Amino acid sequence: SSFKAADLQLEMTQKPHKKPGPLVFGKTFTDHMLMVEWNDKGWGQPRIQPFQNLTLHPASSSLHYSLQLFEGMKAFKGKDQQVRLFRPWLNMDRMLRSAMRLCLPSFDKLELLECIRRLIEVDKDWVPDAAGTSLYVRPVLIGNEPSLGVSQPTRALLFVILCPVGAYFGSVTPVSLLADPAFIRAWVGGVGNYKLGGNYGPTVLVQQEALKRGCEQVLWLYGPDHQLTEVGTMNIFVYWTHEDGVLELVTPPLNGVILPGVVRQSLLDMAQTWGEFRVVERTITMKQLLRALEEGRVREVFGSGTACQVCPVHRILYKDRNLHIPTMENGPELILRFQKELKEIQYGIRAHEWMFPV
Amino acid sequence: SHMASSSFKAADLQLEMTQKPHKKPGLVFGKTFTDHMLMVEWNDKGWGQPRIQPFQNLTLHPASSSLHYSLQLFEGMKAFKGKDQQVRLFRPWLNMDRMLRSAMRLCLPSFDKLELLECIRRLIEVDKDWVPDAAGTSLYVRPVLIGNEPSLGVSQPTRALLFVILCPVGAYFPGGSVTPVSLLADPAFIRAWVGGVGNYKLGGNYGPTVLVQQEALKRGCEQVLWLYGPDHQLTEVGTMNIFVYWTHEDGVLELVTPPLNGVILPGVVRQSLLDMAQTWGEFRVVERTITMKQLLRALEEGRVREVFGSGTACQVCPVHRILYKDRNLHIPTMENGPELILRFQKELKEIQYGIRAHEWMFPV
Numbered sequence: 001s002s003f004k005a006a007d008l009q010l011e012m013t014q015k016p017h018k019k020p021g022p023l024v025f026g027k028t029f030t031d032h033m034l035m036v037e038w039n040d041k042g043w044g045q046p047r048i049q050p051f052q053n054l055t056l057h058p059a060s061s062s063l064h065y066s067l068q069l070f071e072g073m074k075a076f077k078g079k080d081q082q083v084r085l086f087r088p089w090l091n092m093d094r095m096l097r098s099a100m101r102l103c104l105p106s107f108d109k110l111e112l113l114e115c116i117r118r119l120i121e122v123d124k125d126w127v128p129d130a131a132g133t134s135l136y137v138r139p140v141l142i143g144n145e146p147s148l149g150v151s152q153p154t155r156a157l158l159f160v161i162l163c164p165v166g167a168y169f170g171s172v173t174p175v176s177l178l179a180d181p182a183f184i185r186a187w188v189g190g191v192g193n194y195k196l197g198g199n200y201g202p203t204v205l206v207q208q209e210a211l212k213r214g215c216e217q218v219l220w221l222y223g224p225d226h227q228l229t230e231v232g233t234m235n236i237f238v239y240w241t242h243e244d245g246v247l248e249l250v251t252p253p254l255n256g257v258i259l260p261g262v263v264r265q266s267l268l269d270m271a272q273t274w275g276e277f278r279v280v281e282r283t284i285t286m287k288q289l290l291r292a293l294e295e296g297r298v299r300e301v302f303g304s305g306t307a308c309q310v311c312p313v314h315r316i317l318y319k320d321r322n323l324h325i326p327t328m329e330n331g332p333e334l335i336l337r338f339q340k341e342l343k344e345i346q347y348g349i350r351a352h353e354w355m356f357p358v
Numbered sequence: 359s360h361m362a363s364s365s366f367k368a369a370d371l372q373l374e375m376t377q378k379p380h381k382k383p384g385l386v387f388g389k390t391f392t393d394h395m396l397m398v399e400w401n402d403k404g405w406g407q408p409r410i411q412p413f414q415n416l417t418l419h420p421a422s423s424s425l426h427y428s429l430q431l432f433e434g435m436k437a438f439k440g441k442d443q444q445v446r447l448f449r450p451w452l453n454m455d456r457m458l459r460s461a462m463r464l465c466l467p468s469f470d471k472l473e474l475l476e477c478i479r480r481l482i483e484v485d486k487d488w489v490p491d492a493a494g495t496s497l498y499v500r501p502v503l504i505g506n507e508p509s510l511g512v513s514q515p516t517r518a519l520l521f522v523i524l525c526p527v528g529a530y531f532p533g534g535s536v537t538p539v540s541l542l543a544d545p546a547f548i549r550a551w552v553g554g555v556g557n558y559k560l561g562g563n564y565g566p567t568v569l570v571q572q573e574a575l576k577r578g579c580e581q582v583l584w585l586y587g588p589d590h591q592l593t594e595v596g597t598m599n600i601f602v603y604w605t606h607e608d609g610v611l612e613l614v615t616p617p618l619n620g621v622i623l624p625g626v627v628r629q630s631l632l633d634m635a636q637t638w639g640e641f642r643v644v645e646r647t648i649t650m651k652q653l654l655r656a657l658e659e660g661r662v663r664e665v666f667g668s669g670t671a672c673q674v675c676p677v678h679r680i681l682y683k684d685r686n687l688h689i690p691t692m693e694n695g696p697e698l699i700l701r702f703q704k705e706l707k708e709i710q711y712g713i714r715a716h717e718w719m720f721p722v
């Protein structure tokens with residue numbers, strides 16, 4: 001069964017937060033949150049309430065066995081103050097897949113989307129409109145059984161919090177990546193293709209190691225052929241002339257060790273629609289990248305994700321071998337084009353079915 | 359060497375007793391808790407004073423990194439009450455060592471292992487009447503350390519909470535007689551990978567197993583046999599380490615368990631079984647990879663005596679069946695006594711309940 005937006009209960013805040021006057025990601029929260037509880041009677045009524053702490057039993061399975069998943073998606077405000085969510089249906093789809101993998105309760109994707117819309121509407125004045133700014137939406141679903149048994153929970157909590165977010169860049173600044181095969185994010189037969197809290201905790205130490213070695217983010221390698229899987233919390237794309245002499249955009253396939261990014265899917269959809277070069281999903285190895293760089297066949301390498309939309313890469317430290325990636329010497333033409341078509345769509349400059357109006 | 363330890367100190371313990379003690383049990387595992395809990399907070403000025411307080415809810419900021427990015431780890435260890443009503447913890451130092459390794463892996467704050475152990479001893483002392491004394495019963499101790507940064511940044515937290523809760527637990531085997539389990543051995547599900555975090559007791563390793571355990575039941579099995587590698591190595595059973603007692607391919611009787619290569623949690627019971635068998639000096643004790651091919655051959659040749667899991671939950675658990683590639687493999691554990699299992703159970707019982715003095719026991 002599902003909670004219904006029709007049953008929403010609104011508790012407006014009596015202690016509104018002061019709004020920002022330099023926005024740093026994930027530190028500043030809006031005045032309200034969504035909360036829906038689930039138990040043996042099913043889902044309770046959803047409520048929009050003032051941002052507040054959670055009260056959890058010390059044995060909550062969310063805290064002992066990581067019965068927890070989350071999402072991340074942005075709302076954008078156009079010039080005329082219309083707020084729109086980018087492809088939120090895909091986030092709902094992904095959140096439901098995560099829930100099933102952790103044996104957490106199902107819900108109706110459109111009911112949740114409408115509750116989220118209602119929440120953003122309430123806090124609409126928190127949505128910034130300066131260039132490159134957005135409102136970040138963080139849904140979370142956790143198990144909440146007061147039992148140390150490793151088992152399917154009979155209680156759960158679903159909540160959503162919101163953060164206004166500043167510009168990521170106006171001009172794209174590239175990043176350096178540490179590529180060490182010692183580090184593994186996910187594996188075939190694992191859960192790297194679900195947005196589960198458990199996938200992220202172990203990366204904290206690795207990211208520290210990337211900084212210690214003078215890099216900004218982690219290029220996650222997998223397997224004996226040192227496959228390039230993902231970069232930090234972004235999918236990875238390479239724009240090059242492949243070994244067969246064909247200009248192509250390649251990104252690793254959804255074979256279980258990649259999170260299916262919404263931006264990733266959008267970039268594939270956009271480039272396939274242009275019909276100007278080959279667009280493929282295929283494994284990418286460090287062997288191929290090295291050879292391509294030596295042959296001058298690499299144009300651009302970048303990450304995709306909700307944080308920045310598209311992020312150029314200029315350097316990869318592969319163990320002790322420092323590799324220059326010529327992205328910024330090549331425009332970066334494709335990155336700029338993607339960033340432009342997404343900006344026009346996201347801020348309402350071009351009407352589009354990918355946007356969900358609030 | 360001039361600075362005081364950054365760790366919280368048992369010397370600074372603060373005590374608050376419950377106003378309404380709950381009535382003890384007259385029992386499913388892990389649902390019944392005692393009257394008090396330990397809590398310690400960590401922030402930018404370090405560890406606060408540890409406190410024993412009435413069992414109560416946690417209050418967490420909704421952005422807590424414990425809930426978004428699984429900055430969480432835990433331990434599990436037991437205290438046992440002897441005939442002298444004396445309570446003793448089993449090898450708790452090893453649990454403290456493992457907890458600290460887990461904390462470092464998740465960039466959570468270090469602490470002093472002996473200070474935590476003393477705080478835990480104090481908590482159990484307060485709730486001593488909760489420790490059962492019936493055959494096979496014990497008190498399960500659940501320490502937890504979680505990150506608690508109020509921000510969505512994936513980063514080392516500047517805030518953390520360490521707490522400890524207690525559960526009285528009934529006999530694992532009703533009647534005090536081991537009963538065997540059946541295992542599903544399907545290589546599609548992989549618990550952990552080399553270079554991963556399977557050798558740490560992190561919450562993240564457990565949530566993904568819930569669906570797999572459900573599949574095992576759906577297929578008529580009781581627990582999961584976790585296989586690894588293209589050669590289907592037997593790694594662990596559910597939340598237990600795995601042991602095989604057999605005559606090996608070289609004709610030598612041995613007890614074998616997989617080595618600590620990174621995909622195995624280093625169990626305290628596992629180490630104790632190795633230690634115990636080595637001390638006896640009656641047969642070869644070895645840490646070596648075990649493959650399904652090896653087990654299949656050993657079974658066909660009548661070389662397998664006993665297969666069992668080890669862990670804090672039951673100490674030792676026999677296995678009588680493994681479902682692998684749609685085939686049901688009978689494991690003759692019970693037909694072989696199970697001699698070794700029974701011997702291990704008895705020696706552990708005598709140590710844990712204080713029938714024999716032993717350095718492994720830590721008195722409360």
Ligand SMILES: Cc1c(C(=O)Nc2nncs2)sc2nc[nH]c(=O)c12
Pocket residue numbers: 025072136165168200233306307308510511512
């Ligand atoms: C969404 C986001 C970040 C992030 O960490 N996102 C995750 N998604 N999953 C796990 S962390 S870092 C970051 N920096 C700037 N602006 C952003 O919007 C932003």
Ligand SMILES: Cc1c(C(=O)Nc2nncs2)sc2nc[nH]c(=O)c12
Pocket residue numbers: 148149150387434498527530564597670671672
């Ligand atoms: C400690 C324990 C269990 C357990 O789930 N332990 C974990 N350790 N790590 C993760 S779960 S199940 C169980 N059943 C009976 N008696 C017990 O003492 C017991």
Ligand SMILES: Cc1ncc(COP(=O)(O)O)c(CN)c1O
Pocket residue numbers: 072195230232233234235259260261262263264304305306307
């Ligand atoms: C591991 C991982 N990979 C890729 C992405 C990019 O996903 P999206 O484009 O949906 O933001 C994210 C962020 N959700 C991530 O956490």
Ligand SMILES: Cc1ncc(COP(=O)(O)O)c(CN)c1O
Pocket residue numbers: 434559594596597598599623624625626627628668669670671
């Ligand atoms: C994966 C795994 N393996 C083995 C064990 C057994 O560990 P111990 O003997 O320390 O209880 C546990 C429980 N800690 C576990 O969670």
Ligand SMILES: [Cl-]
Pocket residue numbers: 087088089090353354
């Ligand atoms: Cl869509």
Ligand SMILES: [Cl-]
Pocket residue numbers: 193254256260
């Ligand atoms: Cl997928």
Ligand SMILES: [Cl-]
Pocket residue numbers: 132134168306307308309
């Ligand atoms: Cl953005």
Ligand SMILES: [Cl-]
Pocket residue numbers: 449450451452717718
């Ligand atoms: Cl010891």
Ligand SMILES: [Cl-]
Pocket residue numbers: 557618620624
């Ligand atoms: Cl280890």
Ligand SMILES: [Cl-]
Pocket residue numbers: 494496530670671672673
């Ligand atoms: Cl026991």
